[PDB]
Scaffold this active site. Sequence first.
Site, PDB file in Angstrom:
ATOM      1  N   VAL A 102       0.820  -1.206   0.000  1.00 40.21           N
ATOM      2  CA  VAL A 102       0.000   0.000   0.000  1.00 40.21           C
ATOM      3  C   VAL A 102       0.858   1.261   0.000  1.00 40.21           C
ATOM      4  CG1 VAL A 102      -2.002  -1.130   1.012  1.00 40.21           C
ATOM      5  CG2 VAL A 102      -0.224  -0.141   2.473  1.00 40.21           C
ATOM      6  N   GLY A 103       2.150   1.139  -0.278  1.00 39.40           N
ATOM      7  CA  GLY A 103       3.015   2.299  -0.277  1.00 39.40           C
ATOM      8  C   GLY A 103       4.446   1.913  -0.563  1.00 39.40           C
ATOM      9  N   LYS A 104       5.146   2.746  -1.328  1.00 38.07           N
ATOM     10  CA  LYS A 104       6.490   2.425  -1.777  1.00 38.07           C
ATOM     11  C   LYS A 104       7.201   3.704  -2.201  1.00 38.07           C
ATOM     12  CE  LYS A 104       8.676  -0.463  -5.382  1.00 38.07           C
ATOM     13  NZ  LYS A 104       9.773  -1.169  -4.678  1.00 38.07           N
ATOM     14  N   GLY A 105       8.469   3.820  -1.822  1.00 34.83           N
ATOM     15  CA  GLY A 105       9.281   4.971  -2.162  1.00 34.83           C
ATOM     16  C   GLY A 105      10.738   4.598  -2.013  1.00 34.83           C
ATOM     17  N   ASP A 152       9.456  15.536   9.507  1.00 35.84           N
ATOM     18  CA  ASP A 152       9.017  15.143   8.188  1.00 35.84           C
ATOM     19  C   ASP A 152       7.498  15.073   8.144  1.00 35.84           C
ATOM     20  OD1 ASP A 152       9.681  14.548   5.470  1.00 35.84           O
ATOM     21  OD2 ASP A 152       9.338  12.416   5.851  1.00 35.84           O
ATOM     22  N   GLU A 192       8.993   0.124   1.621  1.00 36.81           N
ATOM     23  CA  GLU A 192       7.623  -0.203   1.287  1.00 36.81           C
ATOM     24  C   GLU A 192       6.824  -0.346   2.566  1.00 36.81           C
ATOM     25  OE1 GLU A 192       8.141  -4.028  -0.595  1.00 36.81           O
ATOM     26  OE2 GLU A 192       8.967  -3.036  -2.377  1.00 36.81           O
ATOM     27  N   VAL A 193       5.541  -0.029   2.481  1.00 40.64           N
ATOM     28  CA  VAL A 193       4.587  -0.392   3.515  1.00 40.64           C
ATOM     29  C   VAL A 193       3.635  -1.424   2.931  1.00 40.64           C
ATOM     30  CG1 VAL A 193       2.923   0.465   5.176  1.00 40.64           C
ATOM     31  CG2 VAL A 193       4.798   1.930   4.450  1.00 40.64           C
TER      32      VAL A 193
HETATM   33  C1  LIG Z   1       3.890   6.759   6.930  1.00 40.04           C
HETATM   34  C2  LIG Z   1       2.582   6.570   6.558  1.00 40.04           C
HETATM   35  C3  LIG Z   1       1.906   5.410   6.912  1.00 40.04           C
HETATM   36  C4  LIG Z   1       2.554   4.400   7.635  1.00 40.04           C
HETATM   37  C5  LIG Z   1       1.927   3.180   8.011  1.00 40.04           C
HETATM   38  C6  LIG Z   1       0.565   2.844   7.722  1.00 40.04           C
HETATM   39  C7  LIG Z   1      -0.107   2.462   8.719  1.00 40.04           C
HETATM   40  N1  LIG Z   1      -1.354   2.172   8.256  1.00 40.04           N
HETATM   41  N2  LIG Z   1      -1.295   2.457   6.755  1.00 40.04           N
HETATM   42  C8  LIG Z   1      -2.191   2.379   5.755  1.00 40.04           C
HETATM   43  C9  LIG Z   1      -1.829   2.679   4.457  1.00 40.04           C
HETATM   44  C10 LIG Z   1      -2.823   2.620   3.447  1.00 40.04           C
HETATM   45  C11 LIG Z   1      -3.982   1.859   3.620  1.00 40.04           C
HETATM   46  C12 LIG Z   1      -4.964   1.838   2.616  1.00 40.04           C
HETATM   47  C13 LIG Z   1      -4.830   2.627   1.478  1.00 40.04           C
HETATM   48  N3  LIG Z   1      -5.896   2.618   0.434  1.00 40.04           N
HETATM   49  C14 LIG Z   1      -7.249   2.403   0.899  1.00 40.04           C
HETATM   50  C15 LIG Z   1      -7.850   3.770   1.269  1.00 40.04           C
HETATM   51  N4  LIG Z   1      -7.739   4.661   0.144  1.00 40.04           N
HETATM   52  C16 LIG Z   1      -6.404   4.875  -0.298  1.00 40.04           C
HETATM   53  C17 LIG Z   1      -5.711   3.530  -0.698  1.00 40.04           C
HETATM   54  C18 LIG Z   1      -3.675   3.396   1.301  1.00 40.04           C
HETATM   55  C19 LIG Z   1      -2.682   3.393   2.291  1.00 40.04           C
HETATM   56  C20 LIG Z   1      -0.504   3.121   4.234  1.00 40.04           C
HETATM   57  N5  LIG Z   1       0.376   3.196   5.254  1.00 40.04           N
HETATM   58  C21 LIG Z   1       0.020   2.878   6.514  1.00 40.04           C
HETATM   59  C22 LIG Z   1       2.662   2.292   8.745  1.00 40.04           C
HETATM   60  C23 LIG Z   1       3.973   2.568   9.087  1.00 40.04           C
HETATM   61  N6  LIG Z   1       4.571   3.695   8.735  1.00 40.04           N
HETATM   62  C24 LIG Z   1       3.925   4.612   8.014  1.00 40.04           C
HETATM   63  C25 LIG Z   1       4.568   5.807   7.644  1.00 40.04           C
END
Ligand SMILES: c1ccc2c(-c3cnn4cc(-c5ccc(N6CCNCC6)cc5)cnc34)ccnc2c1
Length: 288
Positions: free
Chosen positions: A11-14, A128, A18-19
């Site tokens: 759900v995240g990458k840079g 940040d 990655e997350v």
């Molecule tokens: C920075 C930001 C976050 C974290 C996180 C983090 C914790 N919970 N989480 C959830 C998402 C996430 C879930 C669902 C969606 N989608 C469904 C809703 N609509 C958009 C797409 C998108 C993204 C991403 N990162 C995280 C954990 C650890 N360090 C971080 C540092």
Amino acid sequence: VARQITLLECVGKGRYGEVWRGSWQGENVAVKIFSSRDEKSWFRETELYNTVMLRHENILGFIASDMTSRSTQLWLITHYHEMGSLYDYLQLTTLDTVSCLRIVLSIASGLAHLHIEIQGKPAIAHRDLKSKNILVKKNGQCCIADLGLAVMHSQSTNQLDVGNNPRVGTKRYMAPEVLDETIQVDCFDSYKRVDIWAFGLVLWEVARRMVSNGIVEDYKPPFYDVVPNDPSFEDMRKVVCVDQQRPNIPNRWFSDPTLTSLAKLMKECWYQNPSARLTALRIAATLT
Ligand SMILES: c1ccc2c(-c3cnn4cc(-c5ccc(N6CCNCC6)cc5)cnc34)ccnc2c1
């Protein structure tokens, strides 16, 4: 404990890693897997979460930190928030007055909690802060994530601890004193003031998505008009420092009381003179 987690989706990458959404003991958890280029952010975030005792509804809840194999990987395991970052959320919804204030008040609360020395805790500056580092919880409050750059201060010893992460903050959100490199790095208040700067930029991002008189702005990042995707230091220097530009206020905000207040708060986060900027605590007081 990392070995009991099933990775489900990224759900995240840079550049930083990655997350993942993962399954641990039947619940969604988030797993940040660090790049080898960003191991020291793992060190710092692990340092904070189990020496400082951050437990607060508006700071991302920590589950575990682990080394594992997949090949050595550094994992940070936290609460999963299904609504994603504030950055995603603002693109896919508009806000009413209540849910706009709930968002901004919870961010201010979390940042004040970090900033304030106290089962106590040192004073912490984030460094940040941005919409991508703030999660939206199911109850509509937010919590602050990513403590990889955090700096600490204690009043009992007057020790400032800046770690030694070479990681640079997000350029779009850097305060002018960071961009022109006159910030005094051995003074802890300098770091609180850059958090306040970035907080004003996030405040602006949220406010744009609050409906008033049936109109709303599109989501945009700060400085969307004047810098490209992924701006350089010199790009940001020119806008914020040389031209002293600040994000423009939509005319319609001055016809709504709540958005007029938020506009004033933002103003007072963007003073060129860092010591004039409001504090997190004062912002949170206004917002109640
Ligand atoms: C920075 C930001 C976050 C974290 C996180 C983090 C914790 N919970 N989480 C959830 C998402 C996430 C879930 C669902 C969606 N989608 C469904 C809703 N609509 C958009 C797409 C998108 C993204 C991403 N990162 C995280 C954990 C650890 N360090 C971080 C540092």
